[PDB]
Amino acid sequence: SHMSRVQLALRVPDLEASIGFYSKLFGTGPAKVRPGYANFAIAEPPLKLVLIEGAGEDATRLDHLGVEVEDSAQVGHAARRLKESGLATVEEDKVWVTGPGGEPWEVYVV
Ligand code: NA
């Protein structure tokens, strides 16, 4: 199986303006739009961009990060590898790990 892409989830103050900006930046409209969130599936560069409405803030912040893989089998291998590395993990197919500075990561399947 074995390929993957980065999930970049941004907490944004202005969702509507952000959708417009990122459509222009990556040259494609969003794949999915709902009240309070929108996501882009970008081929080049390979990226899953998630825009999360945060009307409470006044500046774009990092919401969370992720590795998006092809199937559940890849998640398992990732989950086991992270555990062997000595990283404290929580595994459901999903696995969550948090960096030293508090940035949340998730390895999940599309
Ligand atoms: Na990527």
Q: What separation in Å is there between the alpha carbon of 3 and the centre of ligand 1?
A: 10
Q: What separation in Å is there between the alpha carbon of 68 and the centre of ligand 1?
A: 8
Pair 57, 98: CB distance under 8 Å: no
- DSSP 8-state class, residue 51: E
Rg of the Cα atoms in the chain = 15
Annotated resolution, angstroms? 2.3
Pair 28, 49: CB distance under 8 Å: no
Domain encompassing residue 34: 1-110
Number of structural domains found in the chain:
1
Beta strands 32-34; 61-69: pairing state: unpaired
Burial class (CB in 10 A: 0-12, 13-18, 19+), 50: buried
The CATH number covering residue 40 comes to 3.10.180.10
Report how far residue 69's alpha carbon sits from residue 98's, in angstroms, rounded to the nearest whole number.
18
Q: At 107, which amino acid appears?
A: V
User: Is 64 annotated as contributing to ligand binding?
Assistant: yes
Vertex 86, ends 9 and 66: CA angle to 5°?
10
Gaps after residue numbers in the chain (C–N over 2.5 angstroms): 92
